[PDB]
Amino acid sequence: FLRTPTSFLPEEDQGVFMTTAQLPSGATMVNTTKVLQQVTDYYLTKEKDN
Amino acid sequence: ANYFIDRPVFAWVLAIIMMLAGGLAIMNLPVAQYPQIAPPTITVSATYPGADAQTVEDSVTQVIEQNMNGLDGLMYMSSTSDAAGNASITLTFETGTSPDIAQVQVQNKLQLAMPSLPEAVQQQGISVDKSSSNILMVAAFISDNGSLNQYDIADYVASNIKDPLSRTAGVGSVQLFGSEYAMRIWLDPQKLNKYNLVPSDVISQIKVQNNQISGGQLGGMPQAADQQLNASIIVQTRLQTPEEFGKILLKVQQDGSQVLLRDVARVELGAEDYSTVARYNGKPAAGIAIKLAAGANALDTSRAVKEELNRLSAYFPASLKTVYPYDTTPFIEISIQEVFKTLVEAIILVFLVMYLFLQNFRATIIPTIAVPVVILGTFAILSAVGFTINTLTMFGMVLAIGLLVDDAIVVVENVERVIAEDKLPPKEATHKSMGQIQRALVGIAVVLSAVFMPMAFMSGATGEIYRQFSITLISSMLLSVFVAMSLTPALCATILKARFNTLFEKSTQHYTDSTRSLLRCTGRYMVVYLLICAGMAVLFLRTPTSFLPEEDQGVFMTTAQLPSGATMVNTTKVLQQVTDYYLTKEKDNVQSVFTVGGFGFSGQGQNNGLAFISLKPWSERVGEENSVTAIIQRAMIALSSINKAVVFPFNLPAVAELGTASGFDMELLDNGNLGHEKLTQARNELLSLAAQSPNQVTGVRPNGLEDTPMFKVNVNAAKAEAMGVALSDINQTISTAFGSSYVNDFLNQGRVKKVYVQAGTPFRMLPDNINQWYVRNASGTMAPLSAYSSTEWTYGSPRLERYNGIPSMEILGEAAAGKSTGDAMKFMADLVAKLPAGVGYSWTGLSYQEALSSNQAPALYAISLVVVFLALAALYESWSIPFSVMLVVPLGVVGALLATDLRGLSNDVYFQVGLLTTIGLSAKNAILIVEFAVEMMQKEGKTPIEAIIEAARMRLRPILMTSLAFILGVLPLVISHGAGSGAQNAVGTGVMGGMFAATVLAIYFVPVFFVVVEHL
Amino acid sequence: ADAQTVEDSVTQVIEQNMNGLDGLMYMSSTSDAAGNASITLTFETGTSPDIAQVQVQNKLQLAMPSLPEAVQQQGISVDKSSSNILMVAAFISDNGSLNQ
Amino acid sequence: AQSPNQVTGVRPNGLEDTPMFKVNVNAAKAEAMGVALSDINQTISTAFGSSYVNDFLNQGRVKKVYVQAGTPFRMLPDNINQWYVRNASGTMAPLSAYSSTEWTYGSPRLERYNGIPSMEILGEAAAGKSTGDAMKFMADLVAKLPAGVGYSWTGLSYQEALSSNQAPALYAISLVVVFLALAALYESWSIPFSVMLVVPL
Ligand SMILES: CCCCCCCCCCCCCCCCCCCC(=O)O[C@H](COC(=O)CCCCCCCCCCCCCC)COP(=O)(O)OCCN
Ligand SMILES: CCCCCCCCCCCC
């Protein structure tokens, strides 16, 4: 009873998830838009099956 | 039922469950001196800096009062408008209304009403507070070494103490006795004259330069493509140091010299509210008042707050101590400890009595374990219904202990008797005795519940105390019946086996021989009974009425009031005299004196002051010479020589309800159209007409302040406008100079603080100062203020008051001798009717509850009689028998009345609950005698006399055991004189004597009533 | 406004009053550099959200007089809703006529 | 970050300090030439920030009207040189005259938890470990930090920590309750022991 790890509730596959994209402080919306476009391209090409 | 006898393990498990639930209850249960008793109130406070009484009443008070409608459960609403610019509107809501709902309703109405108030009171903000009186602690902060003055300590306690606490459990209405820092700017009329400036220019430049400008963003959005930079812009920031406020550039002269604010004014980190001076033991200090919360624990909250102060005492800058004046926590702790001691001593005495009577350790072991089971179960029930452990509930349990003991004794005595005679084994004997007393026990439960419910169903302030008492008694009684039916029979089944005794047998034989004389003069006996009954009524018409006895809470308060128009210098002097007396001529008893001048209970002012006075712990003052009552009555005579003050010490009110059943509070509403002068003329017709008849009303004193001189400045608009100066400029410079002018906010040590502008101290203290200020024409020239304005010395009021939207006067009085409240509030009416036409009267606060529902007392005490009659008829299966169970209650009533009246008490609530307990016990004894008598009549054929005598002989011992145990249990309560002595004596002297008369007269009269009823 | 500007002139003012009302399990407060103050009080399980909002709003106007202007003609937005998105519904243009 | 076998992907839920433009306006120099400080402040604030002026009607709905400088005139530290402020006599003087621009540093987002500043942190547990192990590991990691910093679990962590302490007590009351129930149902104290000696199995 002391060797077992502790937890609250197991993780589940809810069918959705999120990704955050944080740029260096002082960057503008142009660079953030480019970064998010790269993220969208990766997800929509390399994960087109899921 | 009787199936627990065959299964002792079931009964033991139920007992263990009761004990566990009781322990879990007492571990987590709120403790307090008293529960919430006063009807919920909502207080609306508004501040108008510098406004008069009339100006406040005309602008802030009336507008707020006109839009307080649609509130549910609103009994009345009273408003006070001071001369310091404070308007306070209190709305009293009905009992049971949710205070949060009432607060939100009032605040929403005020939210919609706000745009009508002047900007100067809008800027301060109007505070709606769900809170009442009965401050918990007045913990104060003092300077040890020096340097730190009043304002510095007040600012520290406002900026790093008030907010860190007030999140503690049971703490929700913290009030301050100081004022946090501000950026007081003191103007100089001559320096302003030299540079051709006015306070308006100073205020405008402060508003312009002490501003927070939103710079925006370099870059920002929408942005062009190829934008790689995005930063904020800083343009300005609110000033922080007082040296920065002195560099504000008011103007630039043609010569080129710069005029700064420091050149026309003295800037200084001062205070916001300057009209409050707090001193601890003479030393200057500033403190806070912790008004507790609705649902609170009066003990652990105190420990947690003390621990918080110890924790954040290392953050204290230097030489700052954290003393605790007031602090009425030890009184609650001592009261609860004493009641627990009484409860345990009752069990010890009961065990001793059972040993001395039954003379069998096995026999006596049963109640000694059965009683704590019931006590713990009742604690669990009180926690399950949501009842806090306070003085009322514990003192109700003090009668409950005797009620449970009586059941335990009767069960054990019957089992012991049946194993004694008839040679029945313990189990068979237990079955026999329980068959004998089973339905009698349930009938007794019904009768006692019917006796106790009427007190449960009252309303108002009385209703809550009565509810606490009756809920406690009902829970304890109903649990005791079930436990006596379940736990006790198993214990008697498994425990008992196969000098004074001879004296008791001889006494019982003598009693039977004397009781046999029913065949001689029975009728005359009844006549005597009637006389006693009549005497009871006579006593019931002589005992005075009171609410609760005053206690030795350990602290009291003195109020020093200067006559009128008296400055803070004289008030501080008078309070210094008061604290010097209390700390040099009473040093043995008095520990601390915390004197706050300016803060009077009758209202803020420079002619008021109040001193909290603490006392050395009860372990250091003993007797009557060193109690609170004697201390205040010794100090009253000593302080009559305070040389122009009306200082008046007094003890803490019980729950702040009323001044005994003699005090009344009427208000003389003007109505019609008559003004304030014609209303004060009516108030002067009264206070004299009433004093002409001192047989009914004595202390008719006019609560409220009286007329004072007032300076009047008559500006001449025509001349001023003809020669160039607008009336706005004159009216603004006078107001800003003499009566403060909030400008904006600023940042100090990471905290937002106000900025004020006022005239210099020496330039606003005399009527000859007004002709020292100058105002600017349209062409830039400056002209004196005396060329326009004239001066007068008119008369005016310093504190106006209104009631329900009608100008009132608040005449409060007291009843004379034995004349009760009702005759007082009947004589004040029909005396108001003789006043000039227009004025009316209204009862408030104390008399209101007694002006809408008064017949709510006896209807349920007649319903109780009807219900108990029905229950008894069901028990005995006849209609005439219950009369000789009803004819026994006056026997206990008259005894309790005598034992109370001939010792020095009154008709307090504790007397009422003790009287009902004695009534219940007498009814139970009569029920149990008549039960055996009727069983003999209906089962083993006998005559109405031969059966009743045998029943009385059988029941002699249980009555003499329970009554003696109950009398001895409450005996130390009567003799106690320490902390909480009044409540102890009240729950003592009554029952101790009600029980004695009940037992003696019941055992000597029940056969007479039985014979008369059966033969009639 | 700036981050410190907001955190001192708006967040401090609103924060000066909410200390403990019914069940305050814990309190958070963020102040951005885009002019955004986001106090996020969290009460104990079983508290009535309506009563909690009532208490929060009856203690917020004890701080309202200390707030500046241009925070008013936009409006304070007390909310008792959840803090986590339940559903996002996006709207697009099929052919590409309407811009964002 | 250097202990990947316990905690993986620990990141802060906040924003880092940024450079910030600062403008200093000479009140004395401005007031000497007649241009008011209030007017300068208002022009700068409206140009680079915005100004909600009024409401108006669009397709039957009330919307807001905003005044701001154009996109090309709001982008560079030298753009502040193009704005002119009107004198008290009607003449226009450039804003670059009585002003000085510099750069400083400032935080773009300030946080507070329970009333004190905070730096809320996110991060998952490494493979093989559980959230309790990572929670304890980070509580240990905090102890090796400069004095003047604390740690507070919040959100899901609050409830997980509460449950971990709750459970053993709940086992205790459940065992005592089942013992008492058996003792009451069966009139004996033997079965309550012969049965309660089996729960470890
Ligand atoms: C077989 C018998 C022997 C074995 C018994 C075993 C029982 C063991 C444990 C018994 C103790 C628990 C049950 C006793 C009552 C406690 C629960 C009271 C709950 C409570 O607080 O309600 C009170 C109602 O008064 C009350 O006490 C309820 C009044 C109920 C109506 C009574 C008659 C009313 C008048 C009608 C006259 C006509 C006669 C009707 C037949 C007051 O309410 P609160 O404080 O919550 O409210 C506040 C706002 N007001
Ligand atoms: C098994 C029969 C027991 C005796 C008759 C029932 C008595 C009920 C009394 C009132 C309820 C406890």
Author numbering:
A (entry chain A): 554 to 603
B (entry chain C): 2 to 499, 513 to 1030
C (entry chain A): 52 to 151
D (entry chain A): 705 to 905
What did the study's authors say about this model?
Bacteria can resist antibiotics and toxic substances within demanding ecological settings, such as low oxygen, extreme acid, and during nutrient starvation. MdtEF, a proton motive force-driven efflux pump from the resistance-nodulation-cell division (RND) superfamily, is upregulated in these conditions but its molecular mechanism is unknown. Whereas we discover distinct transmembrane state transitions within MdtF, which create a more engaged proton relay network, altered drug transport allostery and an acid-responsive increase in efflux efficiency.
Here, we report cryo-electron microscopy structures of Escherichia coli multidrug transporter MdtF within native-lipid nanodiscs, including a single-point mutant with an altered multidrug phenotype and associated substrate-bound form.
